[PDB]
Swiss-Prot record, chain A:
The protein's assembly and partners: A dimer in solution, but in its membrane environment, it exists primarily as a mixture of dimers and tetramers and spans the membrane asymmetrically. Component of the ankyrin-1 complex in the erythrocyte, composed of ANK1, RHCE, RHAG, SLC4A1, EPB42, GYPA, GYPB and AQP1. Interacts with STOM; this interaction positively regulates SLC4A1 activity. Interacts with GYPA; a GYPA monomer is bound at each end of the SLC4A1 dimer forming a heterotetramer. Three SLC4A1 dimers (Band 3-I, Band 3-II and Band 3-III) participates in the ankyrin-1 complex. (Microbial infection) Interacts (via N-terminus) with P.falciparum (isolate K1) aldolase FBPA; the interaction inhibits FBPA catalytic activity.
Species: Homo sapiens (Human)
This protein's name: Band 3 anion transport protein
Posttranslational modification: Phosphorylated on Tyr-7 and Tyr-20 most likely by SYK. PP1-inhibited phosphorylation that follows Tyr-7 and Tyr-20 phosphorylation.
(Microbial infection) Interaction with P.falciparum (isolate K1) FBPA: annotated segments: 12-30
Record PTM Phosphotyrosine, positions in chain: Y7, Y20
Tissue expression notes: Detected in erythrocytes (at protein level).
Region (Disordered): 1-32
Similarity comment: family membership: Belongs to the anion exchanger (TC 2.A.31) family.
Disease link: Ovalocytosis, Southeast Asian: An autosomal dominant hematologic disorder characterized by ovalocytic erythrocytes that are rigid and exhibit reduced expression of many erythrocyte antigens. Clinical manifestations include mild hemolysis, intermittent jaundice and gallstones. However, the disorder is most often asymptomatic.
Function: Functions both as a transporter that mediates electroneutral anion exchange across the cell membrane and as a structural protein. Component of the ankyrin-1 complex of the erythrocyte membrane; required for normal flexibility and stability of the erythrocyte membrane and for normal erythrocyte shape via the interactions of its cytoplasmic domain with cytoskeletal proteins, glycolytic enzymes, and hemoglobin. Functions as a transporter that mediates the 1:1 exchange of inorganic anions across the erythrocyte membrane.
UniProtKB/Swiss-Prot annotation, chain B:
Protein name: Ankyrin-1
Effect listed in the UniProt record for changing D322H: In a breast cancer sample; somatic mutation
Name of the gene encoding the protein in the UniProt record: ANK1
Disulfide bonds: none
Positions bearing Phosphoserine: S419
Source organism, top-level taxon: Eukaryota
Domains as described in the record: The 55 kDa regulatory domain is involved in regulating binding of SPTB/spectrin (beta chain) and SLC4A1/erythrocyte membrane protein band 3.
ANK repeat segments: 34-63, 67-96, 100-129, 133-162, 164-191, 195-224, 228-257, 261-290, 294-323, 327-356, 360-389, 393-422, 426-451
Amino acid sequence: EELQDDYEDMMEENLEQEEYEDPDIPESQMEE
Amino acid sequence: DAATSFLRAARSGNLDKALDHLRNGVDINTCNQNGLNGLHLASKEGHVKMVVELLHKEIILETTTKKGNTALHIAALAGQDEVVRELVNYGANVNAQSQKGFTPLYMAAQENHLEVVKFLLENGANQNVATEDGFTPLAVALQQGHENVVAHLINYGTKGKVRLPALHIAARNDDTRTAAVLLQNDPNPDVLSKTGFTPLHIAAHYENLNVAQLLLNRGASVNFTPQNGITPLHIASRRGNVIMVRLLLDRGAQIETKTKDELTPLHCAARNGHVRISEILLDHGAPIQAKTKNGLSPIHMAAQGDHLDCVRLLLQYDAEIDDITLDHLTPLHVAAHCGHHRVAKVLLDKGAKPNSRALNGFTPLHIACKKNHVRVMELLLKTGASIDAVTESGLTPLHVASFMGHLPIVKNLLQRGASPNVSNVKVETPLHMAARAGHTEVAKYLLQNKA
């Protein structure tokens, strides 16, 4: 506690690289 | 007499007396007969405040004693965990070798200082650097019987530096003093983390304006582009850091830079509903029609996030209301898919076409009926959405609702005069769709109608 942000993995999670990506345009085709 | 008194104050932790001596004019780099300067003496005794103050006063961090020991060597041998942490934060070389080849990790391991060994390993201490005799930290730990130290050394192995670089840590804390010392030692403000981000990226994420100004004044690249393409401006716009965005724009940040998925900073601002940042970027020339890899413009992202005011601002700046993604989804399609009826109301009041067709012929009404978004459905039907529009497969909104089993949608559609006897490309009615999915209530309402 109070020092987890000093580590690379925690910083990676904090910066959230996924939030700068286009996730997807879901369609969910009604048929199958 | 003055230098001797200063060194005695450093050993005893008398920070006031040492500071008064330094104010008088005593050389801060003065050392005793053994080559121990004030930093060495303070590090031996664990005087953390004295160490910090002397570092702020520009003591040479890697000065060695007559045996080749730096301050980090002495802190590790003395087992001063706080001092070791502080020295490493200010740029101490964790792999420094004394005259006889001892490293700080070796000194910590021989003395059974588990916390120091762990911290040094996490900071990239190399446990394979041997002494002149050929002994490693593991070898001395085994000889002295320090079982915990041996176990930690074996387990860590070569996991490497898992802490951030010191300048990244300073940037995270907005620590201008530590950053100034680090940059005095290492003039590279663009030091890289394992993930590829510079300290300016960290400063922009946390809106640490002071350290960001220091980094930019020391040659940091305002436009640094990692592999993923996330510049500091992208981070500032995504986080809603208005003041950081203004600072970065003033120092030459590019407005039109694209990430790996082709998101501009305006895309990041709109996606999180940051109205002021979106306005600033637009006023600085950000292209309002920029498209991601999937063909999403900022209005699409604003609609996707239910960011009503961001949608309003983008429309006020001449955003194309009927812009289409690669799937031919308009912002109205996105709003119907996510159930955001407020965004849909704003879009339709501004002239969005209520009968736009997606790639499979789905209209916004079709999507709203699929997802059971009744409020979007009522708005669309009240603003001229066709209730009998068919997709390519011949599906009406009633077909979709009956298949999904959304009873309120089916009820409302039938009450507004939707024929239940329409047919698909296969001659299949809403009743067929209800039967196929076993939605007994929807089938019962359909049959109580003229199905």
